[PDB]
Structures are given as C-alpha cells and as structure tokens.
Design an enzyme around this catalytic site. Structure first.
Site, PDB file in Angstrom:
ATOM      1  N   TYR A  35       6.847  -1.948   1.270  1.00 14.78           N
ATOM      2  CA  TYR A  35       6.125  -3.173   1.022  1.00 14.78           C
ATOM      3  C   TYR A  35       5.433  -3.085  -0.332  1.00 14.78           C
ATOM      4  O   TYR A  35       5.107  -2.008  -0.809  1.00 14.78           O
ATOM      5  CB  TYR A  35       5.126  -3.404   2.163  1.00 14.78           C
ATOM      6  N   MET A  42      -1.085  -0.987   6.027  1.00 17.11           N
ATOM      7  CA  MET A  42      -0.569  -0.292   4.864  1.00 17.11           C
ATOM      8  C   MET A  42      -1.278   1.057   4.753  1.00 17.11           C
ATOM      9  O   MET A  42      -2.505   1.121   4.817  1.00 17.11           O
ATOM     10  CB  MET A  42      -0.797  -1.119   3.596  1.00 17.11           C
ATOM     11  N   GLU A  43      -0.485   2.130   4.639  1.00 13.41           N
ATOM     12  CA  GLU A  43      -0.978   3.489   4.492  1.00 13.41           C
ATOM     13  C   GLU A  43      -0.932   3.905   3.014  1.00 13.41           C
ATOM     14  O   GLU A  43      -1.316   5.022   2.709  1.00 13.41           O
ATOM     15  CB  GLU A  43      -0.144   4.526   5.258  1.00 13.41           C
ATOM     16  N   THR A  44      -0.414   3.051   2.115  1.00 17.62           N
ATOM     17  CA  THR A  44      -0.347   3.363   0.693  1.00 17.62           C
ATOM     18  C   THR A  44      -1.059   2.295  -0.140  1.00 17.62           C
ATOM     19  O   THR A  44      -1.184   1.145   0.273  1.00 17.62           O
ATOM     20  CB  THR A  44       1.107   3.540   0.243  1.00 17.62           C
ATOM     21  N   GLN A  57      -7.200   5.095   7.854  1.00 18.81           N
ATOM     22  CA  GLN A  57      -7.364   6.406   8.447  1.00 18.81           C
ATOM     23  C   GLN A  57      -8.811   6.818   8.272  1.00 18.81           C
ATOM     24  O   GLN A  57      -9.535   6.199   7.509  1.00 18.81           O
ATOM     25  CB  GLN A  57      -6.325   7.342   7.840  1.00 18.81           C
TER      26      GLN A  57
END
Length: 291
Positions: free
Chosen positions: A91, A132-134, A163
C-alpha cells in the site's frame, strides 16, 4: 465512541479453522469485529483468506456471505470495522491529494456512497481501522478526509492499530494529528508485551490519551494474541493479564478493553473449563475480582 469490551479481528484465519463472520457475532464475548483486510490500496485488493473467493469482472473480491454477516452483526448490536494494511499489505499514496481522493473511493466502495462494484453490496461498515505497519505518505491527509466525508453518518469510527513501542513510527502522526475513535495497541511482537517486564500501557499510551490525542475521549485497547500461534512473542495466559492489568487500568476512562488477533485463534484457545480466550477476557472485565 466505540463500545467498551472485546474487539476481534476476523478474516485472516490465525486459528486455522475460521468460519463465517456470523458465528463470531453470536458470541457475547465480542463487541467489535474488524474485517482483515484491505491488503492493498489505492489499487484495492481484499483478502479474507478462506471466506471469499468470488470476484467482480475486474478482480475485486465480491463477498455476498460477508455482506450478509455485516448486516447480521449490526443487527446483533456489534460494531463492524474494515481494516487496511496488515503486515503483508502492499500500500501507499504518492501525495496528500491521492490520499484525499481515495477517502472518497472508500466512502463510495465500503461506506454509505455508491459505485458499481461494492464488495459488500448494500452493507455499510461502521468505520475503518488503520493497520499500516510501515511509514508512508498522506496518512494524516487520508485520516482527516475520511473523518470529514463520514461525519454525517450516525455512527462512524476511525481507529488505528499501532504496535506498543511509543511513538509508533507508522501511525504516530495520524495518532497525534487526527480524531481517533479508538486505538488497538499491539502489545506483541515487540519488547513491551505483557510478559516482557516493560509493559507500557499505563505510561506511554496513557500519556498519549491524556495530552496528545486530539480526541480526549479516545479509547485505548490492550491488543493481545488470541493464542500462542498468533504472534512470534507476546501471548499471555489470563493469570498473566490479571497480574499486569489491574483496577487502575480497568477503571481508566480511556480504557476500551481488549483487542484480539484474532477471532479464530481466540475462540479455539480454550482453558480446562472449555472457556475460550475471548470469553476469559470478557469475564475478567465484567467481574475483575479484587486483585
């Protein structure tokens, strides 16, 4: 804004034996269900693992059984969100403008708007979850435009799942710049799990809610693995949860409850009394005991 209690992700089948969404909404332990995921955007890709394999002519998932279960979950008084990203997501936006347009796309594809190809047909989700983890471009513009566009609905929720390490690098700007209904903090796959000795709900995140969050009524949820198999590290038995999540937390105005990755996982993970992990947590919240 959202109902306190237990929030579960659903769609990615951490358990292995995931079944229809309706089954999850029959459980009194669960208050919020979060569809995992829109794995890609703005070039949209949906992925519900073992539960939706039909597509429209352009390849977008068309999920009649999920659509029915959304309407059914809402009828049973459950909140249904759609989550974006995930660890396996591809994404990103090229600009704030692209980000604002795609909010409109979301309003029309998943929200109360209209468009030719709606994966859930006439079902309308109650809100979106940023997972979204980035780091990327245009997240704040995206969050704000979603809020603006959806601000005339009766119930609209914008949530995120950072997180536990504070600040969250992926979503910190959204969290500090936009009106968030709820935050599902992942206390797993990082140092600040409930078991590590560095649990940071009552320090960093409580601070977040009190002095940083635009929305002062933001609900913070303790995001937990549903079973040992649902994370690399971070899974805790209920006894461990109780040791570290006491009255101070349980009675905080900004404490929302527990998030779980995920529904299939939490349901299959039963104690000796045959009580599932989601229910243990719910039972804990309703009747904390004393210590």
């Amino acid at each position: 804004q959202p109902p306190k209690g237990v929030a579960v992700y659903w769609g990615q089948n951490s358990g292995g034996g995931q079944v229809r969404l309706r089954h999850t909404c029959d459980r009194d332990a669960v208050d919020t269900v979060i569809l995992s995921f829109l794995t890609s955007f703005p070039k949209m890709v949906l992925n519900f693992s073992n539960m939706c394999w039909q597509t429209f002519p352009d390849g977008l998932l068309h999920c009649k059984d999920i659509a029915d279960d959304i309407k059914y979950c809402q009828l049973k008084g459950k909140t249904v969100l759609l989550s974006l990203g995930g660890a396996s997501g591809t994404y990103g936006f090229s600009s704030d403008d692209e980000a604002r347009q795609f909010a409109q796309t979301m309003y029309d594809t998943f929200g109360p708007g209209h468009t030719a190809e709606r994966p859930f047909d006439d079902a309308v989700v109650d809100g979106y979850d940023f997972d979204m983890e980035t780091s990327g471009v245009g997240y704040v513009a995206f969050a704000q435009e979603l809020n603006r566009l959806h601000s005339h609905m009766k119930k609209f929720y914008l949530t995120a799942a950072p997180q536990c390490p504070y600040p969250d690098r992926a979503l910190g700007d959204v969290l500090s710049s936009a009106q968030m209904s709820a935050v599902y903090i992942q206390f797993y796959n990082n140092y600040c799990s409930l078991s590590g000795g560095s649990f940071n709900f009552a320090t960093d995140w409580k601070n977040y809610a009190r002095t940083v969050s635009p929305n002062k009524n933001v609900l913070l949820y303790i995001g937990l693995p549903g079973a040992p198999r649902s994370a690399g590290l971070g899974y805790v038995d209920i006894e461990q949860v109780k040791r570290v999540v006491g009255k101070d937390i349980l009675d905080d105005p900004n404490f929302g409850g527990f998030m779980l990755w995920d529904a299939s996982s939490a349901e299959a993970n039963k104690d000796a009394h045959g009580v599932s992990y989601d229910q243990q947590l719910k039972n804990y919240m309703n009747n904390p005991g004393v210590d």
